[PDB]
Design a protein around this nucleic acid. Sequence first.
DNA 1: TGTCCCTTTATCTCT
DNA 2: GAGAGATAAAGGGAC
Length: 489
Amino acid sequence: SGARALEALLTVAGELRGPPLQLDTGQLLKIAKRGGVTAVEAVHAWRNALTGAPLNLTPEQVVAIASHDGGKQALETVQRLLPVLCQAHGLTPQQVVAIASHDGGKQALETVQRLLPVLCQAHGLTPEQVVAIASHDGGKQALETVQALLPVLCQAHGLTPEQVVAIASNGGGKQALETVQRLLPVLCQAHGLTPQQVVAIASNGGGKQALETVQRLLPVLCQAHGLTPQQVVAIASNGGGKQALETVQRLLPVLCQAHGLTPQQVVAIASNIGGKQALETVQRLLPVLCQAHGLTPQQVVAIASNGGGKQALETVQRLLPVLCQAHGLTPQQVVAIASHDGGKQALETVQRLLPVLCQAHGLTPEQVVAIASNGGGKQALETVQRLLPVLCQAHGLTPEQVVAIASHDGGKQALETVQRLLPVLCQAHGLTPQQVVAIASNGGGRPALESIVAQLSRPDPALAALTNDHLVALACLGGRPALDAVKKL
DNA sequence: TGTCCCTTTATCTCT
DNA sequence: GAGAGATAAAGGGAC
């Protein structure tokens, strides 16, 4: 009955493509791959209840919840617990989705429910801090561990609640927490690290192995390799962790002696998530990129030194000719696009969309490069392609303004939020569009605009002190953080 | 056969 | 630009 079971499964997928979820093939694939057949079936059985009152989940939220080991249990649990978490604990549905959307989401949900009161009332955490702790695989473990260990970590060890939250808020947060508890004294007292440096190391995924590996290799990397404790700390706390540290141990001589890299640029390469992969890839590709592509070593190092640098390097090697000779991009432009986290996605997206953006939207190659040369470049490019025409027709923006909003980290968010909040800002708050554009055209433009609309609607006397124009100027180069900075004085 | 937890790597967003 | 936070995905081990 394998063929009938298969027919049943495909009928289920087909039905999900209809109401109420209207899932696309990508979404189906996501749930299948990450949550399995049981998650696909669970979504199908509960589609009405997940999208209906009292949950009202969007299809994207349903997809995010299902797309994990135990996805079925998470979906089941969200149906039981969301009304209490929202109405009793004061969480928003999106915060609930965030707690739910990990392997073991059911456990983290039951645990936020049980623990949020003690964490906030007795330990002094905010609900947002509790959400951040919960929103990872093993969230239950981290929540219980913070609850158990925050008092010892703060009083006996001197850490702030914020620092404990930082350590706890990664996958394996429990491991990281216990390892800080164990290893904070040695690393400070014996190695002379500050507590903040230890927190900075501990607050990445694999924080525990990173701490243990800093203890293990700090002396040999300094002594036998010539690095400073600072460099070792940067390598350990920049996401590279244990893998990066050990790979620097192995490859530093070869990269310096044979390939001619300074130890500083080797450190720059090691100092991101996937630093091990980046190091190995520079070792492999430095000759080829520097003899048969005329890229300088500086340029290669610059590409390698971001998270997933490996991917960026291989992608540069593959696409540099096509982008230079077919799309008319200069190698410097290709380097600039490559030299961010996710440079691979940005490059591939430029290869795909450059012609479209130049010819259907009239953008010059320089503008396309401008948009592409930030983290999340792919996202920004795709949402300019989507929203350029509507923002010009409906909201009366120029292509320049659209490119400007787009050309920062989070450009996608800033564009979408302009689309969502431009009407009410200008209509109900006699706010000007050039003004809203001004707010949107920085990193954090999104939360800036949102804090603005929050102020105008449910204002806050304390903050209710500046002009619909003074707050504008404030958001315009401090954003949300500036708005909060004033609104606590 | 799934569920839960942890590490590593890749990508995106904000301070 | 750098540091940091956050979301996603893979792959592994334990029951």
